[PDB]
Design an enzyme around this catalytic site. Sequence first.
Site, mmCIF file in Angstrom:
data_model
loop_
_atom_site.group_PDB
_atom_site.id
_atom_site.type_symbol
_atom_site.label_atom_id
_atom_site.label_comp_id
_atom_site.label_asym_id
_atom_site.label_seq_id
_atom_site.Cartn_x
_atom_site.Cartn_y
_atom_site.Cartn_z
ATOM 1 C CB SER C 116 22.251 -40.461 29.520
ATOM 2 O OG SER C 116 23.094 -39.503 30.157
ATOM 3 C CE1 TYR C 141 28.438 -40.271 34.894
ATOM 4 C CE2 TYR C 141 26.938 -39.422 33.246
ATOM 5 C CZ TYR C 141 28.119 -40.073 33.563
ATOM 6 O OH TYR C 141 28.982 -40.492 32.580
ATOM 7 C CB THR C 167 28.219 -44.007 35.005
ATOM 8 O OG1 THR C 167 27.250 -44.624 34.155
ATOM 9 C CG2 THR C 167 29.476 -43.699 34.220
ATOM 10 C CE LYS C 234 28.377 -47.223 30.483
ATOM 11 N NZ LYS C 234 28.940 -45.846 30.435
ATOM 12 C CG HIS C 258 32.880 -42.969 29.941
ATOM 13 N ND1 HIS C 258 32.213 -43.095 31.141
ATOM 14 C CD2 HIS C 258 32.325 -41.898 29.313
ATOM 15 C CE1 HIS C 258 31.281 -42.159 31.230
ATOM 16 N NE2 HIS C 258 31.328 -41.405 30.118
HETATM 17 C C1 LIG Z 1 28.593 -38.770 23.133
HETATM 18 C C2 LIG Z 1 28.741 -39.715 24.296
HETATM 19 C C3 LIG Z 1 28.143 -39.428 25.488
HETATM 20 C C4 LIG Z 1 28.222 -40.296 26.556
HETATM 21 C C5 LIG Z 1 28.954 -41.490 26.433
HETATM 22 C C6 LIG Z 1 29.548 -41.804 25.219
HETATM 23 C C7 LIG Z 1 29.464 -40.942 24.154
HETATM 24 C C8 LIG Z 1 30.094 -41.302 22.839
HETATM 25 N N1 LIG Z 1 29.015 -42.374 27.537
HETATM 26 C C9 LIG Z 1 29.746 -43.670 27.404
HETATM 27 C C10 LIG Z 1 28.896 -44.777 26.758
HETATM 28 O O1 LIG Z 1 27.932 -45.301 27.692
HETATM 29 C C11 LIG Z 1 29.713 -45.967 26.249
HETATM 30 O O2 LIG Z 1 30.525 -46.477 27.317
HETATM 31 C C12 LIG Z 1 30.578 -45.685 25.016
HETATM 32 O O3 LIG Z 1 29.841 -44.886 24.086
HETATM 33 C C13 LIG Z 1 31.007 -46.973 24.351
HETATM 34 O O4 LIG Z 1 31.998 -46.775 23.308
HETATM 35 P P1 LIG Z 1 31.550 -46.674 21.758
HETATM 36 O O5 LIG Z 1 30.888 -45.328 21.567
HETATM 37 O O6 LIG Z 1 30.556 -47.780 21.452
HETATM 38 O O7 LIG Z 1 32.818 -46.807 21.008
HETATM 39 C C14 LIG Z 1 28.242 -42.118 28.659
HETATM 40 N N2 LIG Z 1 28.178 -43.049 29.654
HETATM 41 C C15 LIG Z 1 27.347 -42.907 30.729
HETATM 42 O O8 LIG Z 1 27.296 -43.780 31.593
HETATM 43 N N3 LIG Z 1 26.548 -41.790 30.745
HETATM 44 C C16 LIG Z 1 26.560 -40.783 29.794
HETATM 45 O O9 LIG Z 1 25.795 -39.810 29.921
HETATM 46 C C17 LIG Z 1 27.427 -40.959 28.712
HETATM 47 N N4 LIG Z 1 27.546 -40.023 27.730
#
Ligand SMILES: Cc1cc2c(cc1C)N(C[C@H](O)[C@H](O)[C@H](O)COP(=O)(O)O)c1[nH]c(=O)[nH]c(=O)c1N2
Lengths: 364, 364, 364, 364
Positions: C116, C141, C167, C234, C258
Amino acid sequence: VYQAGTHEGMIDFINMEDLELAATQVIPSGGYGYISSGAGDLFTYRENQKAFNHQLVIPHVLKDVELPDTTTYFSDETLAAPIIMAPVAAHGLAHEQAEKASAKGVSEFGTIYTASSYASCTLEEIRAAGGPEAPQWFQFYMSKDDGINLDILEMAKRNGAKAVVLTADATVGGNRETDRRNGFTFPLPMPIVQAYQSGVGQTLDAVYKSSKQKLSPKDIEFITTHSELPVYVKGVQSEDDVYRSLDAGAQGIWVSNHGGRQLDGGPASFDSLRYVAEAVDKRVPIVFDSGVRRGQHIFKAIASGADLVAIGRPAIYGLSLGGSTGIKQVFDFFKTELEMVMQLAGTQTVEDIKNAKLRENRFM
Amino acid sequence: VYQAGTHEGMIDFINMEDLELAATQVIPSGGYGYISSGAGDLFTYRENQKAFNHQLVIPHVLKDVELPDTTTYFSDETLAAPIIMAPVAAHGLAHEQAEKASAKGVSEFGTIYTASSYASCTLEEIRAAGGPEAPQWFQFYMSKDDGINLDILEMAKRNGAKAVVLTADATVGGNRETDRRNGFTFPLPMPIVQAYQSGVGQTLDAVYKSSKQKLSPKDIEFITTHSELPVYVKGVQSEDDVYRSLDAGAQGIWVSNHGGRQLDGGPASFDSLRYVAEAVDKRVPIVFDSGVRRGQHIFKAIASGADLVAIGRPAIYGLSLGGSTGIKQVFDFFKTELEMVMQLAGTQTVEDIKNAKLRENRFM
Amino acid sequence: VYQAGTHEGMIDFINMEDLELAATQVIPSGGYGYISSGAGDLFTYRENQKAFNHQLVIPHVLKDVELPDTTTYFSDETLAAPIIMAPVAAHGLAHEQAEKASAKGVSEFGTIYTASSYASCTLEEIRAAGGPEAPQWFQFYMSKDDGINLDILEMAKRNGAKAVVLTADATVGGNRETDRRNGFTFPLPMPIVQAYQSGVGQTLDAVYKSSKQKLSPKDIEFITTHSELPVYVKGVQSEDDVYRSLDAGAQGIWVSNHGGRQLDGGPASFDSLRYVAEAVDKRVPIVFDSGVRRGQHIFKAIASGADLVAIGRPAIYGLSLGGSTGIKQVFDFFKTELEMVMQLAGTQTVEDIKNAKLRENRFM
Amino acid sequence: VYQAGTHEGMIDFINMEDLELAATQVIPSGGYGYISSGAGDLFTYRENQKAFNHQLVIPHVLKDVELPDTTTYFSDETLAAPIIMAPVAAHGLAHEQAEKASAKGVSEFGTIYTASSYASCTLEEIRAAGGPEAPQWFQFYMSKDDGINLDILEMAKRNGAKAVVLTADATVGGNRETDRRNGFTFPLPMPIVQAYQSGVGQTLDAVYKSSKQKLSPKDIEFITTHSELPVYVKGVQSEDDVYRSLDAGAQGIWVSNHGGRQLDGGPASFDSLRYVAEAVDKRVPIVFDSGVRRGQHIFKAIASGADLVAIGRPAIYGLSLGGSTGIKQVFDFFKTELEMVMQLAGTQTVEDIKNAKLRENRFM
Ligand SMILES: Cc1cc2c(cc1C)N(C[C@H](O)[C@H](O)[C@H](O)COP(=O)(O)O)c1[nH]c(=O)[nH]c(=O)c1N2
Ligand SMILES: Cc1cc2c(cc1C)N(C[C@H](O)[C@H](O)[C@H](O)COP(=O)(O)O)c1[nH]c(=O)[nH]c(=O)c1N2
Ligand SMILES: Cc1cc2c(cc1C)N(C[C@H](O)[C@H](O)[C@H](O)COP(=O)(O)O)c1[nH]c(=O)[nH]c(=O)c1N2
Ligand SMILES: Cc1cc2c(cc1C)N(C[C@H](O)[C@H](O)[C@H](O)COP(=O)(O)O)c1[nH]c(=O)[nH]c(=O)c1N2
């Protein structure tokens, strides 16, 4: 003596659900029952809010959008957002300052205020409270007497109404069993309709039955002849109703099921919007209401053919807790959510929302 | 000794749900179980009431309607509303005055009373209680013995029955597990069928098994030959059953699943009505029942091809609490709700209801 | 001071539901709220996990399969299973060792780690913790400033990123009402984006608003020009988004909503996968995420057009309870379930999963 | 020491739900968990029983039926009803007399008994307990060793098996999390498979993994070559599986999902029956199981293409409470319900059930 909310100032809430619950602390139980509930077994009332997830908003990517603009050009008006105040009776049930507080707050937000024929204030007080530049529409519960109807239309004109909204889906009241359980009666006069209805101590069944039951296309022609204001027909949910309205000279269509308060066992208003938008085919503007609690609901209605979305109960709950400040905070909640939805859907302007394509939910 | 309701007078209720609950205070638990429950896992019984929102009533606007008229011209009868009393066994389970109180109340409302073969009173008492001008039909649970069947038909004729309703969907009893848990037996005689069934201390399984299992089209021909009264077949839910009935000389079709008391895992009766109405194609009258608790249910059934709608359990609950007054109040509840629905749907007369177009619910 | 999990070792769990509950004992309530919840009324978040039973896996027989092999050849990589680590911000919310522990555990399992932009560690620490042969991707990002964007891309290259994941579905934050109720702010720096974002004491609304809102196809072209790494977009859930991405030179598509954290009222990601797979037509690789809690979910996604499936929350819960050991145990849980599903479905290899035909659930 | 039920005699129950609850009082908790639960999140297990109301039985009228006959002519057998005992492992978990009590009770009812390879008794004891004229089939969990497979087939022949049922949907065990929570292991030997499996103290994962994983059409050919008994393939839920089975010389198809114990996220067996019946096109007999709790479920399966319906858990609960008497009472419950359904549906014989047309439920 009936004692409503008295606070004027900022209110603390997260969403419209905790706002609805907080209002139970300031609205007397009978008044809260009148505002909050619906007809019969509440199928239609519950379906209104559920129906927004019958159609799914696609969060598009790489759409070259930032700082989405909710500014809405409607006739010669410039609105802050495509979000207006629905006509709701008797604001004195919610706040001591009644329609003065609601007209002032909606004017300060910068959108259309629709005044109810069953208001607890005069239309002169509503115009004075909003100011001379406030866009105001007049919702008409017609008399059986055409002399009284001419007088009410001349009164709307004097107060600068820009449209007449003929409410056609409440020729009698629905079977509102919460009001029956509570023995609800109106506590305040209804000055706009005082020539046929006194308001004080009257049941909602008696109030609707004092207005005209035998509404027909001739009533649209009467309003055009005697006011020369555009007529919106409110409660339209089918193609047949669109054609009856337009053939009689209506210049607007207002899609509604009266917030689930009328005919239980009928469709959700958001589902009816598809049928009405196809029949209207952009010939006149469409207003939409019933069940709106989120910015995503406003976005979906506009993508589905609405030009404006009207707010009912949530605005009244905000009014009860904070007066003019509180009702404006509710409009601001909807505008802020709509800006978030516009950014994530990829729509720079309100016209871009109209061009968005929703995905039907095959697994509801 | 079995002690049923004894009150004669006005009862306090809002809807049929609080009425059903109130009746638990006056009907002995075993009798209440017999009246209230259904077959097997109660899928079909629960689906009956849910199914009315499979089709949605459109609240039309500008329809030029006021003071909707439920008056129904049926054969040479003038009914107060298109709402009739279903055949229900053993009214002495509900009220001491039994079918005398129910026949009197339904006569005073001004509609058709369908007498059960398993009544706790004689048909002579039912005719005497309704008066000579009361429209009464005779529901037939046939004997295995054709001599007994001739005697019962001659008895129906003497008492001025205007139709014979052959109930064909209870050749054996369903798996009614509430009655099993309660060890239910009938407390009173069944005088109409006394030549083959004594009633007192008998299980519902034994009662149905004492009647004819091997019903066929020959039984319709037998009734025509020996009574010259119009024959309705009750329990019809498919095209095949319509054609078998009409080919054998039936002059009416009664769409029912016996209030969910018989074959669990079968369709809701309101859903079956569509299939039956298409097959009948207005060749004979249609009666509809099973699950009716609201005026909107009656409206939807008539819009979908019913000419009359029959009431079961709700009428029995009203009888238990108020006798003739109480059962009439239940019919008045349905008539008053139907008048509200007619006004909001835009139907001036019962024939206008038949021409209304419902919207199928794609999101049930 | 914010105190996260500290344990390094084997954790006791049955499934991802009791693992999610156990993590509440070691993650501070505000951090747990941030990780666990979703946007708005949680329709989209709840639909993600439900949606896997919209399509049904056939347990085929006599398929001549034993010892199914999850080994996945992807580009020049050899992965233990077609299961990768999703980009998730701020692992220091879950465990004191943060992305060092997660990068080490995912490296030891033997699959792709997606870092991330909002990590609590530097990308140099993430590369050092995984080791030089660990497959790592960089989730971007973007800044509003192209100088900062060039610096971040050169930094990703120095650290041996094999792909850049843009993303595009979080240009602003969703309406995450659990974070609002908790007054959530990030406790740690975000070193990768330190040129535009400080992290400490900042709301999630402020963090997303510090990144680029006006993402467009020009941003894909910028990344290609300045990094020569393959770009994955994404948040892609529609055909229109596939064509916009591929026309701009994307070399991968990452289907996601997400984790239900962004636009409430949108579709479940598994349902969107069908639309995206048809549009991509095997032109580029597809990564899939959002709602994955079982091996059967991974199998169904791959049968439906995914080449890789990414894990989010479950991996973070395992990290909180057991560090590198615990996160590897979560990947092992998914691999072991996938081996069971492959045996019972009749698929010897991952390519065989791609050729499996699911049955649509007509009764959801 | 593991102590199962010991009672031999009549048991008190209304339906299979209160029977399942009563068995918790006599089966040790670990054994009850093993019998009662299912795989994963229990979607497929719960769907099995729900799925019977995906298709609706029409209660036809005037069908000229009485005293419906469940007598079933199958090959050279005369069965009391088209209802058979499914193969279920280790009856000693339920009753001390184990498969001796179940074989005796099913013989006395007068139908086919399917013996499990994982029985707690020898096949010689099962044959002795049923008597020489009892129709018995042999369910085969194959060894990896073809010498052991020849020995087991010769043993089935010596004991007069009339068919071999190759169970093909349990090449490994499902994710049975109740057994994991309980630390379940089998308490008794498995004498039929003693050449490869000892039973005592073994996990269900270890037991299934000791049998053959790499089942293929060659295994059907092996059984035909060495036993000359008809082969049924058990676990068939798709057209592809029908064609693989018939092309390899199968003479029967057994539609099942193993009572929801195997691949969670797969279809309900009753829904799969439609696909399998169309592919088989009456070329070979069909056995159906998984979720059967009512006579209406048996009727619907036979109307949908089954020739026989197999009973699992309900028979084991009856065995636990009443031994041979109790298991026969469960078969009698299903026969008595089927007779009620046949009378109300209008089917005189089992062949008439096959010709009944169900209505698809459009509102599930
Ligand atoms: C706590 C937390 C934090 C983030 C995320 C999710 C969560 C739960 N997600 C989204 C992540 O990449 C992903 O799409 C989801 O977590 C998928 O769903 P599930 O958690 O498996 O149900 C996310 N995506 C991304 O591209 N950059 C990020 O920094 C984050 N941060
Ligand atoms: C308390 C109250 C009172 C009224 C109403 C509603 C409510 C809640 N509504 C209906 C109103 O214009 C609108 O259609 C609904 O309020 C929309 O549904 P929601 O409240 O937003 O769910 C209404 N409509 C109208 O035309 N004239 C009126 O006087 C009133 N009165
Ligand atoms: C207590 C009780 C007793 C009977 C019945 C019903 C009930 C509730 N019904 C069925 C009746 O005519 C009708 O089909 C249902 O009552 C309709 O469903 P609702 O009760 O309105 O939901 C019935 N039908 C019939 O033809 N002869 C009878 O004797 C009886 N007996
Ligand atoms: C306790 C237990 C044990 C077994 C089974 C089931 C159960 C409940 N089943 C599956 C069985 O043959 C059948 O498919 C299901 O029992 C049918 O579902 P219902 O139990 O009727 O819901 C099974 N099948 C098989 O072929 N051989 C076996 O040894 C067993 N063992």
